[PDB]
Amino acid sequence: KKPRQKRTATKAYNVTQAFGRRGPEQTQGNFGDQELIRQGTDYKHWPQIAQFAPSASAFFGMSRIGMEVTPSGTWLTYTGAIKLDDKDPNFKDQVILLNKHIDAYKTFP
Amino acid sequence: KKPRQKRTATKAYNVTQAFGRRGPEQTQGNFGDQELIRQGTDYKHWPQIAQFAPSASAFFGMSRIGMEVTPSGTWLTYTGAIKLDDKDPNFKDQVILLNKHIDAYKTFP
Ligand SMILES: O=C(/C=C/c1ccc(O)c(O)c1)O[C@@H](C(=O)O)[C@@H](OC(=O)/C=C/c1ccc(O)c(O)c1)C(=O)O
Ligand code: NA
């Protein structure tokens, strides 16, 4: 199996299997409704989500990168923000799609 | 020009041009020494850095994702942490390489 950061979720290997249960904790993933969790990149609107994912160059160019050495190991930390184009005619639908998946786990077991 | 998150830095379109100068503010990237800044993905050790960058699936699976509406526009926020494999024979070289680039800008004239 690939390193966690290189994994690709699909119906055969879903978001929970690849990335763990969604939840509220720092360094727990919070993104995905039940349909996306189950289907990963097989999700019918995956392209409209993936348009916001950074290239490796942009991940290392845009982000605040840190390194932490703790009792669990050595961790590369990252924070950043990606600006949506509010002049894109698809902007309202993009906001609706992203909001549908952000913290969706709070509404189901 | 591509949306910022899809840009690829190269010798012709470098990290400063693609992603802005390195600096300490939360809106700036902090990653890259003078050689990676000038070369982007032409950098001789780029693969050893890119191995830590998340797939589109992992970026949305591992990260804490948010949406912030501020005076400057609408932002998709991301945070998370990637564990190094201390059983990787290249672990000690990965630590040295990441230490060369994190906040390297502090040493520039
Ligand atoms: O990267 C740039 C911009 C380059 C550029 C612009 C327009 C062009 O048309 C072009 O071809 C290139 O400069 C910086 C910026 O903007 O302040 C960028 O600095 C550096 O890496 C400098 C490092 C350094 C290290 C050791 C030294 O001894 C020394 O003298 C300098 C940063 O700190 O992020
Ligand atoms: Na160290």
Numbering used by the authors:
A (entry chain BBB), B (entry chain AAA): 256 to 364
What's the paper's own text on this?
The nucleocapsid (N) protein plays critical roles in coronavirus genome transcription and packaging, representing a key target for the development of novel antivirals, and for which structural information on ligand binding is scarce.
This was confirmed by the crystal structure of the CTD in complex with CA, determined at 1.7 Å resolution, which represents the first CTD structure bound to an exogenous small molecule. CA binds to a shallow pocket (volume of ~ 190 A3 ) formed between α-helices 1–2 and η-helix 2, close to the C-terminus. The CA molecule bound to one of the CTD protomers was unambiguously found by inspecting the 2Fo–Fc electron-density map. A close inspection of the structural complex shows that the binding of CA to the CTD is stabilized mainly by polar contacts of the carboxylate and carbonyl groups from CA’s tartarate and caffeoyl units, involving Arg276/Arg277 and three structural water molecules. The structure of the complex also shows one CA catechol ring laid inside a hydrophobic canyon formed by η-helix 2, α-helix 2 and the last two C-terminus residues (Phe363 and Pro364). When the apo and complexed structures were superposed, we observed no significant changes in the overall structures, as judged by the Cα RMSD (0.19 Å deviation). However, we noticed clear conformational changes in the side chains of Phe363, Pro364, Gln289 and Arg276, which contributed to the widening of the CA pocket. Arg276 had moved outwards, positioning its guanidine group at ideal distances to form electrostatic (NH1) and water-mediated (NH2) hydrogen-bond interactions with CA’s carboxylate group. Notably, the binding of CA to the CTD not only alters the topology but also the charge distribution of this region, which might explain why CA disrupts the N protein-RNA1 complex in solution.
